[PDB]
Paper text:
This leads us to generate a variant enzyme and probe it for Glc entrapment and the S-glycoside analogue binding.
HvExoI folds in an (α/β)8 barrel (domain 1) and an (α/β)6 sandwich (domain 2) that at their interface cradle a 13 Å-deep pocket- or crater-shaped active site. A vital conclusion drawn from the structural studies with the native β-d-glucan glucohydrolase, isoenzyme ExoI (HvExoI) isolated from barley seedlings, was that the glucose (Glc) product released from β-d-glucoside substrates remains entrapped in the enzyme active site until an incoming substrate binds, presumably lowering the energy barrier to facilitate Glc displacement.
Author numbering: -3 to 602
Write the structure that this text describes.
């Protein structure tokens, strides 16, 4: 369709399927296996990208150009890499991926939304969609086109260190929250075929339903372990949200480290090809987890040649290598050269990677929009995050007897108030895992508002606010306080580091609450990624709030404490009496909760 140097795949007016087929038919084996290769930015250089025909890059947790980098620095790094890819013979742009799982959370000054467990408390899919929209703007502000989200794990045991990344133990709440997908990607057309990938264009990102499948169902919530359950139960609990994701055009699926009934997901042809591709009709690309194929064997990495054979024959399309791309390319090349992996398997993987790249507009807009840089940390997104934090909060108790004056809401005007606890003035603690660093971090790691700063911003100017992190009983009894707000809880963690059999918060925590609440009426704010042992915190507290991991906008806590808004959140998980009861989920024969799924006390706006 015109000029003498005309190449169909480069024509933006031709249909995706014709541009894919036109490009695939021109590629060498090296170009094909290049597309199937994702590498860390930490090992990428122009020459590596160009000479290996690399298809994708990622930032893993904490993989950043430097500490405190601006949105423009991120854009320049991504463009740098993309310039190299676009200089290859075929000019195939790379897709850059990142864990934007509660905002663009590796980026300094990015808005940090509550983690998924808290969003589950909101029962507000439309709020989660809005979070998806804001996240896509903030990811595109940094030049990135691909978010590894959403986690549609169904956590069935809160000893799992990723329990906070699950919206709920109820598959129905996880299904409702797949509205994240059309937030990140855009709404699919009215006509849409379930399983086709979709991204609206340069102001949206590709999404990733992960981790397929049963990441939330491991024995003793041990991260990466064995999910022991029959076909009926995998299909009734862990699968359904994958179908919702297909209907909303999720562009990719990341495979789980976990096994189903002793079979590595990363080697499971029946589930990856039989079910996801041939039954659910997935037409996007399937990506590995991080060294996922390496972990097929025991030990991990002890037969990479197997790892490649088993993972690629199971139907995986793109491999998050992510460092040793030379070994990955050499070994897949040999298996194809020896007839062990047929060319048709390579062509199907490359067809799906190119389908996603063409669909999402990457060949038309391979470079970053410098005008999107101001989207990062935009006050409108913060206001959204604040709304979400507030709606996430679950009021567990509001008066020590039925007869007491309810403590909440608190008055903004009082002569003197106490704000206390390890978590009252710690932005890192309130964001948790996957914030600036992989495992999250302590203190003032990014832009935000702690509980202490929110209280000072909220109260009447005549109200004297005293901060003491760990005050003793005498300090409180002598200080002349009207009331105390005390904030304690879990430290930041992710995945295996947060696997935890006893689920009790670190000291000082209980001690500071007992010391404070012993001397003056107290509202306790519990910062956690999951239910933890709570009876002793309750027994001491006049009121207690489960705030989960509310993110950067701490004023969402104070919006409810002080009666600007009523408490509306409902537990999206069972709150246990004792860890010995676990696993224990809404529905089981032997169901004895401290607080059932769906519990939450209410208040009214003053
Ligand atoms: C992420 O940085 C490196 O991360 C892994 C955590 S694992 C895996 O990472 C994927 C890509 O970041 C995520 O999308 C996925 O949900 C996770 O399961 C860790 O092993 C490395 O030590 C860390 O450097
Ligand atoms: C589960 O964890 C144990 C150790 O805690 C490990 O040795 C075993 O191989 C794991 N099982 C699976 C199938 O991943
Ligand atoms: C409980 O488990 C965690 C993680 O394994 C551990 O760090 C913590 O010290 C333990 N707590 C108690 C009370 O033993
Ligand atoms: C809160 O408002 C509800 C809804 O009308 C009402 O039933 C309840 O009595 C109110 N409680 C307080 C403490 O104002």
């Amino acid at each position: 369709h015109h000029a003498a140097d005309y190449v169909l795949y480069k024509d933006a007016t031709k249909p995706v399927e014709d541009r894919v087929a036109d490009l695939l038919g021109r590629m060498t084996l090296a170009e094909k296996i290049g597309q199937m290769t994702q590498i860390e930015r930490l090992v990428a250089t122009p020459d590596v990208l160009r000479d290996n025909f690399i298809g994708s890059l990622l930032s893993g947790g904490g993989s950043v150009p430097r500490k405190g980098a601006t949105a423009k620095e991120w854009q320049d790094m991504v463009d740098g890499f993309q310039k190299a890819c676009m200089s290859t013979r075929l000019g195939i742009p790379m897709i850059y991926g990142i864990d934007a799982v509660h905002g663009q959370n590796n980026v300094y000054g990015a808005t940090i939304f509550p983690h998924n467990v808290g969003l589950g408390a909101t029962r507000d899919p439309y709020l989660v969609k809005r979070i998806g929209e804001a996240t896509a703007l903030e990811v595109r502000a940094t030049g990135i086109q691909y978010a590894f989200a959403p986690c549609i794990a169904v956590c069935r045991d809160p000893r799992w260190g990723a329990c906070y990344a699950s919206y709920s133990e109820d598959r129905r709440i996880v299904q409702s929250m797949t509205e994240l997908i059309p937030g990140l990607q855009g709404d699919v057309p009215k006509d849409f075929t379930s399983g086709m990938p979709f991204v609206a264009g340069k102001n949206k990102v590709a999404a990733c339903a992960k981790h397929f499948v049963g990441d939330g169902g491991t024995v003793d919530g041990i991260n990466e372990n064995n999910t022991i359950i029959n076909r009926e139960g995998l299909m009734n609990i862990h699968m359904p949200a994958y179908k919702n994701a297909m209907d909303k055009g999720v562009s990719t699926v990341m495979i789980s480290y976990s096994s189903w009934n002793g079979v590595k997901m990363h080697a499971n042809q029946d589930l990856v090809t039989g079910y996801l591709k041939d039954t659910l009709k997935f037409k996007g690309f399937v990506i590995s987890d991080w060294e996922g194929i390496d972990r097929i064997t025991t030990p991990a990495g002890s037969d990479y040649s197997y790892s490649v054979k088993a993972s690629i024959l199971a139907g995986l399309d793109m491999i998050m290598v992510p460092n040793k791309y030379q070994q990955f390319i050499s070994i897949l090349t040999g298996h194809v050269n020896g007839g062990v992996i047929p060319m048709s398997r390579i062509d199907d993987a490359v067809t799906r990677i190119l389908r996603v790249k063409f669909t999402m507009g990457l060949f038309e807009n391979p470079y970053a929009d410098p005008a999107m840089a101001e989207q990062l940390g935009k006050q409108e997104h913060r206001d959204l995050a604040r709304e979400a934090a507030r709606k996430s909060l679950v009021l567990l108790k509001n008066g020590k007897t039925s007869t007491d004056a309810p403590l909440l809401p608190l008055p903004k005007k009082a002569p003197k108030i106490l704000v206390a606890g390890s978590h009252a003035d710690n932005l890192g603690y309130q964001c948790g895992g996957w914030t600036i660093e992989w495992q999250g971090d302590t203190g003032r790691t990014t832009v935000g508002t702690t509980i202490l700063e929110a209280v000072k911003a909220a109260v009447d100017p005549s109200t004297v606010v005293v901060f003491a992190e760990n005050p003793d009983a005498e300090f409180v009894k002598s200080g002349g306080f009207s009331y105390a707000i005390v904030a304690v809880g879990e430290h930041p963690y992710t995945e295996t580091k947060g696997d935890n059999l006893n689920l009790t918060i670190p000291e000082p925590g209980l001690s500071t609450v007992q010391a404070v609440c012993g001397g003056v009426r107290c509202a306790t704010v519990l910062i956690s990624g999951r239910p933890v042992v709570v009876q002793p915190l309750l027994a001491a507290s006049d009121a207690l709030v489960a705030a989960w991991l509310p993110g950067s906008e701490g004023q969402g806590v104070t919006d409810a404490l002080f009666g600007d808004f009523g408490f509306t959140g409902r537990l999206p998980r069972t709150w246990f009496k004792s860890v010995d009861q676990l696993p224990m989920n809404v529905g089981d024969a032997h169901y004895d909760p401290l607080f059932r799924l769906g519990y939450g006390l209410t208040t009214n706006a003053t």
